[PDB]
Design a protein around this ligand. Sequence first.
Ligand SMILES: [Fe+3]
Ligand SMILES: [Fe+3]
Ligand SMILES: [O]
Length: 219
Amino acid sequence: AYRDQPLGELALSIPRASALFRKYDMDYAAGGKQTLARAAARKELDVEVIEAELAKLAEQPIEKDWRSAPLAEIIDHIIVRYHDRHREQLPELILQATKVERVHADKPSVPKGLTKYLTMLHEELSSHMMKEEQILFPMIKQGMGSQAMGPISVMESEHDEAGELLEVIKHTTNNVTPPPEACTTWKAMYNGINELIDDLMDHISLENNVLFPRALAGE
Ligand SMILES: [Fe+3]
Ligand SMILES: [Fe+3]
Ligand SMILES: [O]
C-alpha cells in the first residue's frame, strides 16, 4: 500500500525515509505528490523491496511530525534549521571547491565547474530565502495564506530551479562520490555537499509538502 502514497507523506511520516529516497535519486521534495508507484516505475526500481525497507523504518515513529504542527512553528524552524545553516554552509563549500579545483587541477576526476555551480546555487538560494522571510512567511503568519497562490507558485518555481542546480552539482561530482585519489579536503567537501543536498531537500520538502498546501488551505 506504501506504493499508493505520495513520496512527500512517506518522507514526513517515516523516519529516515528521506535518506532512502535520496539513495534512489527519488525527488520527494519538489515531486512529493508523485506516488511511490509512479516514481519507482520511472526509474525501473523493484517497488516491493522499497516497501519492505520502509516497513522496517516505519517500526519506529518519527521524532517530530510537522504535518500537523502550527505554521508559525514550521516557519521559525525552517529559518534556524535550514535557512541559517545554508548561509553558513555554502560560503564554506565555495572556498573548498576553489581549493580543490586548483590543488587537483591535473587529476582527471577533479570536479571542474563545481565552484561555478555552488556560486550559482548560493546566489539563487540567498535571494530566494530573503523573499520567503521578508514576503511570504510574514504573509502566512498574519493569516493571509489563503491569498498566497501567487507568491507560493513563484517560490515553488524557484525550488525547481534549485533542484536543477543540485542535479548539475551531483553530475559534476560523480553523484558526490570522491575518487580513490581523494585527499582529506576533497573528501570532507563531498561530505559537506551531501549534507547540503540532504538539508535542502528536507527544507524544500517541508515547504512544498506541508507549509505551502496548508497555508493555501487556510490553516
Ligand atoms: Fe525556504
Ligand atoms: Fe523555499
Ligand atoms: O527555501
